[PDB]
Design a protein around this ligand. Structure first.
Ligand SMILES: [Cl-]
Ligand SMILES: [Cl-]
Ligand SMILES: [Cl-]
Ligand SMILES: [Cs+]
Ligand SMILES: [Cs+]
Ligand SMILES: [Cs+]
Ligand SMILES: [Cs+]
Ligand SMILES: [Cs+]
Ligand SMILES: [Cs+]
Ligand SMILES: [Cs+]
Ligand SMILES: [Cs+]
Lengths: 406, 406, 406
């Protein structure tokens, strides 16, 4: 008599049991977030670039011939544009070296042009301090970006015993004072991908083993300010194939020997430009010929402009399994003060005007809670499934012992 | 003999079993946080407002009569305040149209005043680019806030095939150059909720289907800078009644057909002002009469000033079950450079002074890890409880088989 | 016959069972993150400091004698440095009170010097508003930092019924307008830890019961801007000994009666300076003698400079079990506008130049989602282990009933 709903007690097992086994096959994960004060923490690499690509005093006669149009300094008939914009003192200088009567074109490449005309760390870096220790231009590695000759502090390449951070605050990080040298900025007479309307620098904080994409990803620092950048290192760990679609951390993709989102982007930005312009830009890796100024203006610029703005399809990247993110909070105070302008003016052999317009202090450091791990953890292991459907079996063929008793 | 602590083995079951069943009734939840590089991602809406509400050249004789006191331009006896502050060239203009001898008041409402005197996108927008494509004032929807005539890029209303983002960097987002038109700013002679001491604009990044609250929630952008806004879309999902107290996402509340915190706030800001001033402000929805300048100064301003600063009680909102947050990291570089000022001066038919004081470049884009889900997941399902108290029952009436054996 | 792999079915139990018991001993935890719109939320404390330590008009003859070298105003032979930098009008004033012929040294201590020469809230605070209510210098508590005489709004010490926040937006928070008084800045003739090249203020948002470390942790606010600081309170809860190594929240460590990272840092910064200079700095607690200017320059500065930049070893802190973090997003607009400069100039009895160079508006408020809890939760309780190894036992000595049946 009392056994009709005992096979109905089998119906309860089925419904409850069949969902815990479906839940496993969804392969669900939870998140383990730990914000903590670390010790012996590795300091990131800091890349920076002047927003002006070429120093006006270094642009030679041959430099202007090959690259003039690309820099919007010459029209098509190799002369100064009909318009343009002043300048009483500069137009004298430029038209003198725009005189091509007497001139025969000499060999030219953009990498050497960037390298020589590009702004120099040795005259930009007025002051460097990391953790009490004073750094020099030696502590900065030259790296080429779409901006030109750029510089990486703490690149930590070749034997260099990487710099560590212990606690929070400005003192436990990097401080640099810079002269952006506005009096060396190329006159802007038109708009091209090489000229800008802005004075200042671009900065990007990244892992030593991930290349910069400062054109796209970087932050700006304005001249005539001290800028505080309070940071936090975020370690993001993901789960392999069955739970999430991450690509393996330890390589292995193309021109760089560490897989990251940025490396993957530059990888096929190189492929794309080679497969379309027969040409690579200055900042791209590989061994293809460097783009000639004519190829930059006709092919290489629009090609990369297409990839970084229009493309929805060609250069897309998978998620790596390890990602380092840098949370940052920015802040400014004015430099110089009325009470200090004259000091710095004298100290660096400069006008008081100049100091207010060119001088810049950068502070990169971490806050107290400097380290964050965001790791995806498995929610239902195989053993926990068996221990749940097992203890589910012995509940309707094991806890029936107390219902038939009553 | 060996059965005295077997009912003491029942005591172990009770203590361990009664806490796993209490743990279920706490209804606990965990968090699933996923920061990832997305694809086919929806671009937010961008609302912006000039901090000056009314263009000085558009304030007519009738405009000054009705709204003069509210704008701190006239005292109570309809004349220019006894003090005030200059200006040799402006006081000539204002006192000419402050001459009310010969004048008879004409019909007036604030919405039309805002609409006509309000700053115009067509003369503010000097440059617009989204993802390589150039935008025009057509791509901006006019929206009224407490600031006045404001504008929303990518409002995505009425058929408009919403704009998408693929990757990280400035190129995959919006860039706009603006003239805030300081020479059109109303003279500030006193302090009111309509005048400000600041030049610049207010910006707010929000969902297409959530209204702006830019007065309260927005960020500022200063003139004479290029400002980079690196973003991250954060999707926050919460749990319904038993686990958390969220209100349903899909409606359904009052003047807007999507429930959000901002919509809920404006909802009863409208109710409150109607139920206290017999009046609605220009930016509020519904069908009540628009506030007259006199009602603004006497009733509507203090009423809303009470709600947004003092009120602890009247207009409080429940959490929605879906929230879109935008993490943002701001950055500046100077505009113009010494080497480009003259170009832009000529390009827009303006003084070099003007360019340094009025011109502004805004960049809104997402970083590489553009998308974040913060979803609350159930920690103890009903099936996992049964599989644990079941496997708990068969441990003291099932693993006694190995203790009586020894 | 059908019993050879039944002891092989014992092998399955062993492998699956021995990992769920190893998983427990790893003591794993998950994370519960809840971003929500709060109510009745406690407003933080806001500390700020002028970047100039000593007001030029308050530096007396005796002040210059004792502290002159430390301030880089005097060389070693008690005279004005041979160089230095101007100033036609200031060098007249300073050399008059640098005349020590006729002068006999009087008693001196840095705390009184900071207290008297330090910038005064009563002449810096031009405007204060919190949630519609106007605040005065009374609402600001004087606190000494390495900057000098600094000020804390909403310190909430001694009976003060702490201020609350309800919703998001500028209105539900603090707004302050400041004159940093650049015309009162001490001339900078050299570089010391007491002089700076920057005009502006340092700000830090912290818990009422945690001291400031504004030198290290604070953010800057530049003069001639309105700065918006959109905030979010983050409550971080950690797990005691067995799961994580947190130190107890409710005390109990040294000079402050609440354990926090900042309190712990100042604790042994005090110990260190006492145990090395026989000396404490002005901002440090305890009862040791205050450092004399000579001791500052010779001992106390380099000692603390060592701790905040070089030290990897001496002053390291454990994690507390409760931490309050403040996420912040910064933003600027220009002050004053061309149309308002003259008003403020007149209002505060100042030059139009002065207003552009000294005036500053600060806005501290929370966004809509103002409150965040990041709490570490236990992943495998003891009861859930037993209910899993129990339901694991009764799966190979309980679900064999269906395999021997077939
Ligand atoms: Cl790409
Ligand atoms: Cl409200
Ligand atoms: Cl320390
Ligand atoms: Cs450009
Ligand atoms: Cs490789
Ligand atoms: Cs206002
Ligand atoms: Cs509705
Ligand atoms: Cs200093
Ligand atoms: Cs204590
Ligand atoms: Cs379980
Ligand atoms: Cs279980």
């Amino acid at each position: 008599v009392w056994a009709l709903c005992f096979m109905g007690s089998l119906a309860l097992l089925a419904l409850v049991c069949t969902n815990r086994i479906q839940y496993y096959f969804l392969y669900p994960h939870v998140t383990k977030l730990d914000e903590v004060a670390a010790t012996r923490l590795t300091f990131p690499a800091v890349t920076f670039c002047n927003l002006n690509e070429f120093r006006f005093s270094r642009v030679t006669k041959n430099d202007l011939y090959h690259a003039g149009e690309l820099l919007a300094l010459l029209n098509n008939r190799y002369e100064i544009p009909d318009t343009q914009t002043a300048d009483e003192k500069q137009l004298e200088i430029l038209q003198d070296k725009a005189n091509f009567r007497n001139f025969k074109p000499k060999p030219f490449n953009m990498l050497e042009f960037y390298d020589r005309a590009g702004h120099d760390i040795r005259e930009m870096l007025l002051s460097c301090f990391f953790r009490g220790e004073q750094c020099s231009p030696e502590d900065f590695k030259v790296v080429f970006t779409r901006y030109g000759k750029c510089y990486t502090f703490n690149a930590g390449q070749d034997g260099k015993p990487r710099l560590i951070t212990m606690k929070g605050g400005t003192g436990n990080g990097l401080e640099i004072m810079l002269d952006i040298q506005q009096d060396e900025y190329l006159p802007v007479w038109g708009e091209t991908d090489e000229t800008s309307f802005e004075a200042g620098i671009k900065v990007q904080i990244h892992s030593q083993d991930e290349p910069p994409l400062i054109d796209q990803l970087g932050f700006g620092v304005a001249p005539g300010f001290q800028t505080f950048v309070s940071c936090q290192e975020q370690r993001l760990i993901y789960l392999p194939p069955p739970w999430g679609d991450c690509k393996a951390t330890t390589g292995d993709s193309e021109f760089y020997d560490t897989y990251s989102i940025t490396a993957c982007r530059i990888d096929c930005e190189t492929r794309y430009l080679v497969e379309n312009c027969n040409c690579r830009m200055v900042h791209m890796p590989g061994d293809a010929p460097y783009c000639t100024p004519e190829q930059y203006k006709e092919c290489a610029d629009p090609a990369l402009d297409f990839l970084v703005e229009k493309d929805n399809e060609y250069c897309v990247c998978e998620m790596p399994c390890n990602v380092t993110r840098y949370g940052k909070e920015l802040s400014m105070v004015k430099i110089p003060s009325k009470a200090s302008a004259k000091y710095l003016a004298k100290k660096y052999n400069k006008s008081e005007q100049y100091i207010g317009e060119n001088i810049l202090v950068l502070d990169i450091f971490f806050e107290a809670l400097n380290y964050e791990t965001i790791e995806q953890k498995k929610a239902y292991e195989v053993a926990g499934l068996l221990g749940d459907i097992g203890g589910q079996m012995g509940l309707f063929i094991g806890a029936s012992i107390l219902t038939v008793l009553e």
